[PDB]
């Protein structure tokens, strides 16, 4: 943020600090009696967060590669053919 | 890690197969095409390692019924017979 030639990487690397602190926001929000005893079920799930993500989002790729193949898609750019093949 | 190195070889062979359907749609055996023939020679000969692994020393067709008793083994060679129906096209 102080280095003037890197405001575009300074725009993309600090937006994750907004949500990394939002984990710390929910960290002090283990308080309420309907919240606390059942935000411990996501404490039964924090590594399992990494589980079903790495399940289903890799299983997303099992469709996401399978979609563009038979049809003749033609939209390509530098880092938007990845849009017209992978991000869509 | 013999599990891990086999997985990421198999995780990236389908990436290698994803290369030759998008850009490399050519009617010739190209540069990045000949390895898949040597990749299909590499894995079905691991069944050749398993056929010679632990048999009875007289029954050649009575051990292979156990591989016929595995539908995932029929999903292995069933994904080989479809490649012979895919390579010939």
From Swiss-Prot, chain A:
Tissue-wise expression: Highly expressed in brain and peripheral blood cells, such as neutrophils. Also detected in bone marrow, spleen, heart, liver and lung. Isoform 2 is found in neutrophil granulocytes.
Membrane side Cytoplasmic: residue ranges: 33-44
Result when mutating residue 77 to A: Abolishes channel activity
Transmembrane stretches, start-end: 12-32, 45-65
UniProt-annotated location(s): Cell membrane; Perikaryon; Cell projection; Cytoplasmic vesicle
Coiled-coil intervals: none
Regions of this protein lying in the Extracellular compartment: 4-11, 66-85
Effect upon mutating residue 83 to A: Abolishes channel activity
Effect caused by changing residue 33 to A: Decreases in sensitivity to PIP2
Family of this protein: Belongs to the transient receptor (TC 1.A.4) family. LTrpC subfamily. TRPM2 sub-subfamily.
Domains (record comment): Contains two binding sites for ADP-ribose, one in the N-terminal part of the channel and the other in the C-terminal nudix hydrolase domain. Both sites seem to have a role in channel opening, but the interaction of ADP-ribose with the N-terminal site is absolutely required for channel activation.
Description of how the protein assembles with itself and partners: Homotetramer. Isoform 1 can interact with isoform 3. This interaction decreases Ca(2+) influx through isoform 1 and suppresses susceptibility to oxidative stress-induced cell death.
This protein's name: Transient receptor potential cation channel subfamily M member 2
Organism: Homo sapiens
Name of the gene: TRPM2
Parent sequence residues shown: 886 to 973 of 1503
